[PDB]
Amino acid sequence: LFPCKYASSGCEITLPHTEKADHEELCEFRPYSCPCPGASCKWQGSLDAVMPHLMHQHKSITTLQGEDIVFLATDINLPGAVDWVMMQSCFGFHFMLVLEKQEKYDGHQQFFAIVQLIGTRKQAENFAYRLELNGHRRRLTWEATPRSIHEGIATAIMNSDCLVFDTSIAQLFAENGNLGINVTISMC
Amino acid sequence: MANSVLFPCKYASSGCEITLPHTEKADHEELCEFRPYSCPCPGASCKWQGSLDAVMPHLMHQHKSITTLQGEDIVFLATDINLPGAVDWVMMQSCFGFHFMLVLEKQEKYDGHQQFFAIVQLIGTRKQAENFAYRLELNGHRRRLTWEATPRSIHEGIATAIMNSDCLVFDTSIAQLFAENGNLGINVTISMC
Ligand SMILES: [Cl-]
Ligand SMILES: [Cl-]
Ligand SMILES: [Cl-]
Ligand SMILES: [Zn+2]
Ligand SMILES: [Zn+2]
Ligand SMILES: [Zn+2]
Ligand SMILES: [Zn+2]
């Protein structure tokens, strides 16, 4: 038996080595980290402190209001490890929209697009999101339940549990070097 | 009397004996029965060549392990997607008076990275293919991944589109989330457009 990493935050669970990694990802006593990806903010705090932190320390992150929006990522053929981030406001919540370009597999630059709720895991379960890329007679769609920012996105990226494509695919969908991602959030 | 210069059909070497004035050339050729087509089954094993109409018979007689499902909206189950031997899954779909070949391929296109590629091609011409769309959908616990495009024609083939990632492309990790007991169901819907 081993204690959870977040024991010092008030977590009581002791588990064997094999059950430890799964619990801590989903543990409630996990700190809410600055949800903006991926370097180099090291801020942590409570859920109610997240939106003010973004507003005070990440002023260039824009918000669009609506359930049905276009997240237009500019200059997607910019080389290397890039992030695009915006927030979407609907249903009384803010959602973090992230497009990340990273060399997850060696020699293969890929894009990962994912939505997170600024709120709890329990709250996140009432939502669904759709990410849709549109091209000339082409459409690529991903639909899932948004991750709570509590969980982060590193695990979903590693598991490809989000929309995954690459620079090859992106060319079908890009217009003037930009990528329009249709993001629809709905309740279930 | 000087008659005007005649042109042999571009499929003369395949047998076509008709010669024609230049204006009739394109109109005959894109209708000519002697046009050769390679075997559309992936990939390099079969060396058969023949007419468009000889294709589906070739697949029925020489590629008996390929199943044909009937209907515009089907499920293709790719079994044992995790087996190390497993490379290709092929199925035919019959609807709208045509036959469409669904191909799933597992490969390391980038070294060290195993990916699945899925695509549809029409047993027919590009012109015929351009009146269709196809949708591939993977379904899991609160997850859905969808790709929609115009079917490839068999003359163009699918190898080039796969190389370009102009098809459904996904990882072995996410394949697992969509798989049940080692099998991956792909919903395929063909539509007119
Ligand atoms: Cl809709
Ligand atoms: Cl799950
Ligand atoms: Cl439908
Ligand atoms: Zn814990
Ligand atoms: Zn921050
Ligand atoms: Zn001819
Ligand atoms: Zn053959």
Numbering used by the authors:
A (entry chain B): 95 to 282
B (entry chain A): 90 to 282
Q: Can you provide the manuscript's text about this entry?
A:
Siah1 (seven-in-absentia homologue 1) is an E3 ligase belonging to the RING (really interesting new gene) domain family. It acts as a scaffolding protein and interacts with a variety of different substrates for ubiquitination and subsequent degradation. Siah1 functions in Ras, DNA-damage and hypoxia signalling pathways, and is implicated in various cancers. The SBD forms a dimerization interface with its counterpart from the partner subunit to create a Z-shaped structure.
Two isomorphous crystal structures of Siah1 were determined at 1.95 and 1.58 Å resolution. There are two molecules per asymmetric unit, labelled chains A and B, and they form a dimer consistent both with the observation that a single species of approximate mass 39 kDa was noted during size-exclusion chromatography purification and with published structures of Siah1. Continuous well defined electron density is observed for the polypeptide backbone in the 1.95 Å resolution structure, corresponding to residues 91–282 of the native Siah1 sequence. Here, chain A also contains an additional methionine at the N-terminus, which is a cloning artifact. One outlier is present in the lower resolution structure and 96.9% of the amino acids are situated in the most favoured region. In the lower resolution structure the r.m.s.d. is 5.36 Å (181 Cα positions). Inspection confirmed that the NCS breakdown is owing to differences in the orientation of the N-terminal zinc-finger subdomain with respect to the rest of the protein. Superposition of the two new structures on each other gives r.m.s.d. values of 0.80 and 4.89 Å for chains A (175 Cα atoms) and B (164 Cα atoms), respectively. The high value again occurs owing to a difference in the position of the N-terminal zinc-finger subdomain in the two structures. The overall molecular packing in each lattice remains well conserved and it is simply that there is space that allows the N-­terminal zinc finger of the B chain to adopt a position where it can either interact with a molecule at 1 − x + ½, y + ½, −z + ½ as in the highest resolution structure or interact with a molecule at 1 − x, 1 − y, z as in the case of the lower resolution structure.
